[PDB]
Structures are given as structure tokens and as C-alpha cells.
């Protein structure tokens, strides 16, 4: 499936959803400016409501390391 | 109402509290040097306990745009 | 300190052991409560930069505090070397200058008071530390339902003394926040005095309320 | 203070660092309880106006107190310039005069004791502050049902010492209010002594009541 | 105090500011507990009558105490003028004499120790005040059911030290009342020692009882 | 200490009775809490090895502490005699040398500062004692659920100051353990600051949390 | 104390008023807790027998203690007159000798240190008093079920310091009773260390137990 | 009754308490200098808690006419 | 209606009653000395019993700003 | 019985307690200087709480005749 | 009636009984030494048991001012 | 998981806790000088209360082999 | 058993406790100087509370014969 | 009867038994060495169990004054 | 029986089991290196589970004196 379709399941650990997201992003083959937008925006918007709340609290500049570090307890 | 006693409601969106706060800070007769301190300190101090927990993590330099961005849907 | 010898020339007289111990008591036991600045400013009367560095050797060990203090001293020494192109910043901070240079500077005509100047830079760093170690914001200070207004005023001014606020903001806090955070019975009296009230009027009105 | 040099001439000897720290302890820790006036009056023994101004630099920071103090000093300096048309008010307050003028005045024959005079104006301002910071009116002081009469007498006189009352009003308060506000068991003894009783008689009668 | 100058002649050296403050602490904070007399007697070492009057200026303000003190001093000054027809009573009390007369008297051969004599009259007045401010009669001092005998002995002797009793009556109180008012468990041990027991024997027997 | 005589030669001036009493208060009443090292280092200003041995005569009586101290001094005296083949170890420790040798060494050009060196060996032994008497490991220090972060930081740094850890381990403890052992509400704020936070940032963020 | 005059001759300098007051605080407020002996030994640095008698004038008033002290001094003065057939016992106790004799003796070559000797007899009497006023036997000192081993060790050694035991008995008490009276959880650790353990090992093992 | 123990009744009009107070201050044998202090301090101190709350707001300079005017119908 | 008829309703905020009073006073066209008396006297006497109590506690010299500031909580 | 433990009974006439007290003070082996102190201080200290309240009002100079006269029928 | 007959009624304020006593004493016209005895002795003996107790606690030297001052609370 | 929060289970064999601890100490990014302190102090501090009671008796010099040998079957 | 923990039984005759105590003091490996202190201090300290109350009255000089004689049948 | 027969009755005050004992001893007319033994030994052995316990706690050297002083409370 | 057969009974004091063990070891007559192994190893392995736990806590170097001292409470 395309990257737009990848969502976090209601009880899925964030690291597994991130792995699915980036595996799909690698197959999606969009140009790097679009990949920047997708990894900033879709990855947050398609998270669980709790995890999405944690991620939005980081603001827009968050790196993937920070996003995963924040979500370990979810 | 006095700016000192504007407090974010237990379920009030932070943008609504910001609107109440700054609409009242225009009424306050204190000097601009005092209003600067009010914007810096009262806005965080009088936030909702959840939202206040978000805001204090942003540090003392945080802009109002950053504060509002962090507290979306809190 | 500086003392005139029997030859009439000015000479160093060391900051005494039990004065240093009184400063150690202030640093160790009062936990950078704001009276640390009056007590530093008192115990360092007449102190040369060598004496002041001797007093800072007990702030060392409070590694966070001593970091804030050293960086503030270095900042002011740089500001000195910027403003003034005679002692350089490290000489007035007494790290490079000799004791005899410091005493000379302090006793020339006019005096070059490297002691009192460096003591101001230290007091500015102690202010930063006293702010850091403040237990509360001035906004957190409220009068208890049975607390005497005198004791609340003491807590309020002690906290206001531990705050970054400019004198204009401190004036507004004194006029407005002190009333706002009083307990409702006492606050009723303070409101009835109106906005012009001095602290003397506020306290004599609320006495035993 | 003033000290005779080896040349026999009078010279300044600065108020020592640990004396100033003892005054800082009094200002900061005793919250203008009335013993601040005895302790000021003791620590300022022999103080020139320069020494007294050095001691007031720690009342600064208690912005309300220091305001009452400065305005009372300025009031007395104006009263001096009014009564006496030699030191002017700002010279005896040591803001304009030189240290050598102050020591000269204090050591001429007869002495012009600018130190002890200015120290009276400061003690008068400290009295105003001690009244402001009083936690209670003398009327609020009552003996508890199990409180020793000695402890109630101590609280009563401490408050009476913190009050504006003239000596005639203080005499009446001592004779009448002290009895009125005793607890009923103890008050019965005090009433039975009649109106002429001294405090010695009142205390020895109520001892352990 | 008196100090030998570089010329070898005896001269006045004033009772220091922080010694006076230590006496103010004793007067204000220890509420005429009996250690006020040891502490007065210590702080007044070498005091001339001018120094002693300087120390009494802080008992002033305790209007009852200072009345007892002044009247006892006047009584002893009258007794002096009665017994001795050189210093008169007001000269040895230092109200009329000059400082140079007081130092002369204290340093003639033999000395006329107006300081130590007047200091005895002051200690006699302080004794009267310490009795007045005693919280209890010696008869009220009892050992609590769980109180260590050491602490009861301390309370007992502190009160006995605050009492008018002659040394014969104090001896009887020590021998008899101290046993009588012990708690019954401890009292049983003290009774078993019989009447001859010293305090050392009583305390070592009751240790941890 | 060392004082220049009127002949200009350096001579011994004994560590004063009330300075020694201030050290006795530190040894007896503060139970080798870490401020004993600042207070020792202050009270021993200018101390010769004879003065330092006079100060150690009150650590004697704390038989465990004095054993650790003597063995550490002997260890450093042996290390001195090893490194340097002029004072021997027992001379710089002042057990064999004369007072005049110690003052000579301390006042030659360059100085041979047997006082400040031996004072470092004593401070090293006092460090060992302060570690022994530490009530807790740094790992045991946790913030209470209602404890102010300022008070927890004070307890944490006081314990960290009482620990054997090298500066690298102390840095890691400051960065990591201080956050780990905060209470969960406060810990949430500290986690949100990320790993780079200074203590100033941590405390201002958690202020009143 | 003894001070070299400007003429180079040794002369008396009186034990200062505020040193005597510090001894009065020790006698009155610390109730012959064992730190009274370190504090006496510190405050009496350089004391002549006249100075020591001046210090004993505040143990007078503690009639039991002063009796034990006088009789111990008289016992040692008799032992002196027995051993040595120059100062007699009453001269070294300073009751019969002149001040100039005492200073002569203390400053001849070799010195006849009547001060330090009489100070040992006083410390021996203070030891007897400290034993009498001990609140507990060393056998009564037990660790509470939640008491830190550090605090129990402090209580234990403080009591052991207040006991008649020879050093051999104190060594056995340290090795054996300290373990025996620990609480069972802590005692289990101390037993597991075996009999050879030093106090350092015992405390570091039981730290936070 | 002693002036020290004249207290305003829980429902007593302030004018009635003033009449009781000043009628008794004429009986008091104390000097005029003491009576001045009594008029200044006891009258407020012994007022009814509601009325006392009104009176303390008037400050130390307040005349008896002002005090009575403020407390009408309290 | 004439100014004498304007009264505060039992639950009316004081600011609304003041507005009605001064609107009527402007239409009443009495001379300024009478307006001074009316604004001092009728405005208090025609208030609610609670609000009238608060206003009488201010004494006779109170300005309209002070009167309205006092009554905000009623 | 020891003089220190002679106490007036809860209903005992003061004259009966005085008789018990002085009859026992003749037995006490203490010196006359101690007996003087006992007559002055114990007699009041050990009186019945009502009678003791009467006696302490008489002051320290009171004679036994005065003390007995005051306590008739107490 | 004669002075000997005047007694305090069981609930009579002492001042009223004193007034009756001295009005009768003025009519009795006995010589002054007898009046001294009567005013010292009958006036106490004919009081109520409570008031008589209070009066006896004053001892024999009490003036009429002291007697009345003592009995105000009875 | 952070090495600071690895704690021996209430019934966990000490060898299993040692395996968890040292496997995590390899993950910790702290310097070797800090890891030395961790091996010395955390391993004892975080042991099970029974096992911790055994380990503290071994003294500060104890090797891991000695610690494991002492805690067999604890 | 350790001499420190030999204690007289709640009903044990003092002679039986003395036999237990001294039979154990022969086992103790401590020096004679320590055993002297034990005979002087532990024997009293560890006595039964009744018997201990007897023994402490005898003073510090008491011989074992005197101690046993005093405690017969206690 | 002879001295050997004199015993303390189960509720008899010790002073009465002592009086009976010495009255009998005076009539018994035994030589003084025997009287010494009797007054030391029979006088204790023939006391009540409680009083005999108190007396034995005094040891063998007790004088009659001490014995009677000890037994006053029995 | 041979040394291998000697075991501690479920309630047997360790000293009795040690006595049985060494009595058997003396009869077993194995060479000293084997005796060293047996006294280190069998003596522990054949103890009760509790006593065996205490003994293993001592580690391998324990002397017989230490082993018996450790087990006195079992």
C-alpha cells in the first residue's frame, strides 16, 4: 500500500508503526522534499490519538529519535 | 475582570484562554513594562494544570506561537 | 582588608579565620536565601580581590552555584576589558594581579577600588544564584486563612527580593499582587483602603485581622 | 568608630566586617521585633555617620522599612536645619560631610556628637518600623487559660514596647490592661491585690497560679 | 575596660559594640533566666562604672526590671554613703564621677575597685529580677513519671538557683525536697540511699531508672 | 598564625581561644556533615602545623575519626618522604619540627608552605571521615511526593558532596541520577527539558511544581 | 593569657569578656554534655591559673558540680605537694601565688607550665562531672528499629565518651557492645562482618540499612 | 462597667454602642491623655465584627461623625 | 419618567441602574446644584438594600467611579 | 508524717489544717532557719485550692492570725 | 425598724442592702463608737451567706468602698 | 530500560538479575569510568532485599564471582 | 550464650542468675580487665527489675555476698 | 511468754510488734550477747512475710531505728 | 556407615551433625586431600536445607569454627 494508508493500530507500539511507515516510505520513492513533508506530517497525523498527542507536544522540529524516545511509554 | 484572576477553564482550549487573557491585558492600566512581565509569567502561571505542565517544558524563551502550537487539543 | 602599618604605608591584613567561618556558615546553612547577599556584602567590608577570592573558595563545592558565579565574574571581566581599553579584568578579579597591585589601586588618589568593584560583580552572581534557589514564584505567595498579614508581608517581600523583576515591576507587584494574594477577610480591608495605600497603612489596617 | 592613632590624633577605624554581619543578622532574622532597637543601639557604639550609613545599607532591601527610615531621617535633618541656622542636616546625617569633618565634630571640645545624634534619628525611624511590623495591638494580648503569668507578662510588655503610647498611657496600660487581659483564675489574684500593686507583687502572687 | 596606653598610663578602652550586642542578646532573649547573672558577670569583665551604665541602658526598656535595678543600686549607693563618710555612692555608681576618676580609683595602690563593687550592686539587682521572673516555686518542681532524674535535677537546681533561700535553706532543699519531689520509682532509690547521700550518689544510683 | 612583629620579623601568633572553640563547635555539633571541611578550611586560615595540631586535639576523642585522620596524615607524610628525599614528613606535619622552623619555612622566599600543605592532608582525612559518617548513598536520595525540587536538589548535592565519586562520576550523577530520583510529577518536567539541561534550567522549570 | 609587651617582657592579657561569656554559654546551656571538656580546653588556651580561676567562677552556682571540681583540684594540689617537696599546690592552683609568679613560671626556661597543669586538674574534675551528669549507661544505648546506624553510633560514642571505662574496656565496648545493641536487621550485617571489623567497615556496610 | 469591657452587641446599632461607650468614658477616672487613647483605639477595638470591619477601613484619622455615618444600619 | 421614579430592580446590576439613572438625569434638565444633590442622594437612596448598604459605607464624598467600583460584586 | 506532705483536706477547715501543720512542724528535726521558711512557704503551698486562692491574695507579709481570719468558713 | 433588724434578702444586690443599712444607721442615732462597731460588724453579719463570705475574706479593716467594690458580682 | 531501574525480581535468581544488569550495562552510553561505578554500586543497590542482605556482608572488594557464589539459591 | 544476653528470669532466684552469670563469665574470652567491668556493671544491669531495684540501692561498692544477701527470696 | 513465741500478726503495724518484742526481751533477762543475736535475728524472722522481706533487704547491720523507718509503710 | 551416608536430620542441631560427620571421617581413613574435599563439600551438601543455605552464604573458604558459629541459631 501507499504511505498515506499506513496508520498506527489502536494498541500498536509506536516503534512498530514507525518501522512500517519508513519501510513504506522507502518503497514509495517520492522526491526528498515530499519525504521531508511526509516524515514530519503524516507520521504524526496517522498515529494513535494518545501517541499523536505526545508527538504534537514536541512541536514541528522533532527528529525521529526524539519522537520515538517520547513515545516509548505509550 | 483583573488579569491576575483570568485562569484557564478545566476543559478550556488554550487558544480560548489566550484570547481571554490578551483581550484583558489590553484593559489593564499597568505600564508596558509590567504588561511584558504579565505576558511572560502570568500566561503560564494561570494555565490549566495539564496545559501548564506542557508550557513549562518549553522554557522561558517560548513564543506565544510555540506555546499555542504545543497546546493544540490538550 | 587594608591596614596602615606603623610605617604609615598601607598593607594587607588578611580576612580573619572566624570571619571566613562566618561566611562559610552563611553559604552552607542559609541555602542561598536572599540574606546571603547582605551577609556577603557585610563580611566582605574592605575586602581586596585576594580576600574576595578567598571567600569564593567556599562557594566552590556548590558546583552549580560556583559555575554561575564564575561565569558571571568572567562576563563582567570581559565587559570591563571591553569598556576600558591599570587593572585588566583578570587583575580587578584578582586572578592575575599581585596583592600589592590591588592595594596600590585601592589606595591611590583617586582610589581605583578593585575590591568594591569586584564585590559588585560577585553580588551580581550571588543574585543570579539566589534567584535560582528561590523556592517559589512571587505569584505562589498567598496568605493563609489564619496567617497574620505581617507574616504574609514578610514572605511576600522575601520572595520579591529573590526575583528578577525591575523596580517598576516590583512596584506594581507591591501595589497590586500583595493585595490580590491576601486572604479574603484581610483582602477586604486592603481593598477598602483603595489603590494609594502605603505598606504602613496596609499593615496598620490589617493588624490582627 | 573613632580611634586615637599612634600620633595621638583621632582617626577613623571602620565598623568591622563581623559587626556589620551581626547587624545584618538582626535586620534579616529578627523581623523588626523590638529588640532590633537595643541591638542597633549596641552595635552602633561609637559609630560615625559614615558607619551609621554603612549600617543602613542593609535596611535598604526592606524597601518599605528603608522608606520609613529615610523619610524620618530627612524629617529630622530638616528639623535640625530649622532649629540651628558647623554641620547642616545632611552633614550630621553624613551624606554631604566628609569623614574628617564628622570625626572633628565628634572630637572637638565640647564634642559635636554627630554620631550619637544621627543614631537617635535612626532609632526614631526604627521605632516607626517596629510599630508597623508589630503583629498585634496591646489590646489583643490575652493570657491563655493554662499560660504562665510570667509568659503573658513577657508578651504584654514586648507588645507594649512595640506601641506608640506615651509613658502616661503605657503606665495606665501596665496598671489596668495587664490585669484586665489576664485569665480569670490569675485575674482573680491580681484583682485581690488592688490597684496599687507593682509588677513584682503581681508576679510573685500569680507565680504558678 | 581599662587598658595601658603606649605611654604606660592607664586609659579607657570602651566596651566593644559586639560585646554590648552579646549583652543585649542576653537581656532580650533569655528572659531573666538565672544564666543572665553569669553572663552579665562575664561580659562585664574589667568594666568601669561608665561601661556598666552603658550595659544597663539595655535593661532600660524592661521598665519593671530597670525599676528594680535602679532602686537596688540607689539603695546600695545610700548604704555606701552611710558606711563610708574618694568616691561617693553616685561616684562609684558612675552617675556623678568622671571617667578619669573611675579609672584612677580602679588603678591606685591599693585599687579602689569601683567597677567590681558597682558590678556587685548590679548583680544584686539582677538577682531580684531573676527571682521575680522565676516561672515556679522550688516546691512546684516535680519529676515526671518518665522524666530522667538528670533532667529533673537540672530543673530543680535551676529553680533553686532562682530562689531567695539562704544557703542553709538551700542545703535543706537539696537534701530533702529533691528526694520528696522525685517520681515514686526514682524516689524509692533515693530513699534507699538514706539521708547522707551526695548528689553524685543520688544521680549515679538513679541513672536510667 | 604568623604575624610580623614590631621588629619586622615574622613571629607566631597563637590560634585564638574562641577560634578553637568555634572549631570545637564544628567538630562536636555538626557530626562530620560535609560543611565541616569548609569550616575547617576557613578556621585554619594561616595556621602553622603547630596550630593545625592544636585543632586536631579536638578530633581526638572521636576515636574512630581521629584514627582515620592520623593514619591519613601518616600516609601523606610517608608519601612526602618518598617523593622528596628542608622539612621531612614529621616536620611538615609539625610533630618533630620546631615552631621557628615551621615559620621560617612558611616565610622563606619562595615560601615552603608547610601549613597549607599539612592542611591539605588534614582536609583529605576529613574527607574520608565525612564519607564514613554520610547517612545515605547518593542512590538513596529521592524526592518526596510533596517535597520542593529545591530541597531535594539541596539534599542531593549535599550527599553528592559527601561521596567518593570522581568528578566524571559526579557529572554523570548530576546529569542522570538527579533526574531519575525526582518525584514523577517533577521528573516529567525534567525529562521534557532533555539531556542538555543545566541545574539553573532544571530548577527554574520545576519551581513550585 | 600571656602577651609580650612592647618592652619585650611577658605580661598578663586578661581572658576577654566575650571569651568568658562563651564559657558561660558552655556551662549553662550544654548541661555538662561531654563537649564541655573540648570547649573548656579550647577556651582556656594560654590561660594562667588566674584566668582558669576566673573561668571556674561560673561553675560556682552549680553547687554539686563546683564541689566535685574543688575537691578534685584540692586532691591534685595535695598530690602535687606530695610528689614535689617553685610553686606549691595552692600556687599552681593560683589561689596563693601572685599573677607575676604564674607568668614567671610559665615563661622561665624551661617553662613551669602552671596554666596547662592546673588546666589538666580542671579537665579531670570536669570529667567527673560529665560522668555524673551522663543521662544513661553505655549499656542503655540501643539502636531503634528505624534509627540510622550513623545516629546510633553517634549516641553510642557520645555515651562511651561520658564513661569511666579504661581504654581497654572502651575498646571491648566498641568491638562488642556496639554490635550487641544494634537493631536486629543492622546487627545481622555487623555480625556478618565478623569480629575484626573497623568502625569504617561497620558504618559503610550498614549505610542506609 | 469598665470601659475596657463595653462591647457592641451582636445586633446593636453602632450609635447605641457609641452612646454606651462615651457615657461610660465619662465615668472612667483615668486622665484625659488616657481617655484620648481610649476614644481612638477602644471604640474600634470593641466594635461588632461587622461594624469593626467597616470602621478599620476608614483609617486612623476618622472622626466619630465619620465612623457613625459609615455604620448606619450596619 | 422623572428621576425620582428610577429605582434599582431587586436583581439588577448596579451599572445598569446607574445607566438608567443618568440617562434620566440628562433628560430631567434640572439645574446643576440640584443635579449634584440628586447624584449624591437619590442614586444611593433608590438602590437595592444590599447595594444601598455598600454605597452608604463609602460616605457622602464618593465619586461615581468609586460607587460603581464598590458595587461590581453585588 | 513529713511536713512536706501535710496538705489541707478537700473540705478541711483551715484552722484544723493549721493545727495539723504546726503540730508536725514541732516534730521536724530541721533547724529553726528552715522552719521559718516552712512556716512562710509550705503553709500556703499546701493549703486547699480554694483556701490557697484566699491566702495568696494576702501577700507575703501576712501573719498566721490574718491568714486564719481570712479563711474562716472557707 | 432598728439597725439590728436590717438583713440582706436572699437575692438582693449588696448596694441596696448597704443603702438600707446606712439609711437605718442614720436614723438609729447611736454614738459614733457604736456606729463604728455596727458598720464594721452588723453590716457583714447581716449580709447573705455568699456576700458575707466575700466580705469576711477582706478582713476587719475594710472600708465601705472596698466592701461594695468586692460585692459587685454577687 | 535504564540501568538505574533494573531491579532484581522478588523471586528472581541472582544470576538472572546479573544477566539482565550486565546485558543492559552494555547498552548504557555512559563512559567506562561511570560503568565501573555502576558495576560496583548499582548491582548491590538494586538487588533483592534478601540477596542485598547477603551481598552487603561481602564488603566492597567482592568480585562478581564471589557475589554470585554467595547468592546461589537465595 | 554471650554474657551480655544473660538476664535474670522473671521469677528466677538471684542466686540462680548469679550462677548462670558467673558460669558464663568463665567462658567469655575477654581480658580480666574487661571481666572486672562485667562483674561490676552487667550483673546489676541484667538483673530482674525487682531485684535490680534492690541491687541499685546497695551502691557501687557492694560485694557479691552483700548483693546475694539482700536479694534472698526477692 | 518467752521471746521465741512473739510473732507479728498478719495485719499488725511493725512498731507494735517491735514494742511487744522488746517488752518481752526486757522480761527474758538473757545475757547481752544472746540479746544481740535475738534482736538481730528473731525480730526479723518473726515478722510478717512482707515486713520480713523489707527487713531482709536492709542486710544484717541494720539498727532498730532503720528497721522501723523501713517498715512504716507496711 | 561411610561418610557419604551421613546427613543432618530435619531438626538436628548442626553441632551434632558435625560431630557425627567428623567421627565418621576419622573412621573413613581416606587420604588428606580427599578429607579436605569432603570436609569442604560433603559437610555442606549433606546439611539441612536451611543450614545448607547458611553455610553456602559463607563461601568456599569457611573454616569449621566459622561454619559452626554461623549455624548456632538454626
Residue numbers in the entry:
A (entry chain C), B (entry chain B), H (entry chain B), I (entry chain C), J (entry chain B), K (entry chain C), ...: 148 to 221
C (entry chain A), D (entry chain A), E (entry chain A), F (entry chain A), G (entry chain A): 1 to 85, 98 to 221
Copy text from the publication.
pmcThe mature HIV-1 capsid is a conical, fullerene shell that encompasses the viral genome. The surface of the conical capsid is dense in protein-binding sites that mediate interactions with host machinery necessary for transport of the capsid through the cytoplasm into the nucleus.
We obtained separate reconstructions of the pentamer and of the hexamer to nominal resolutions of 3.1 Å and 2.9 Å, respectively, and used these to build atomic models. This results in V59 moving toward the core of the CANTD helical bundle, inducing a different conformation of M66. Additionally, a new interface forms between helix 1 of adjacent monomers, including a hydrogen bond between T19 and the εN of R18 that may further fix the position of the R18 ring, and a salt bridge between K30 and E29. Here, a largely hydrophobic interface forms centered around Y169, L211, and M215 in the CACTD, and A64, M144, and Y145 in the CANTD.
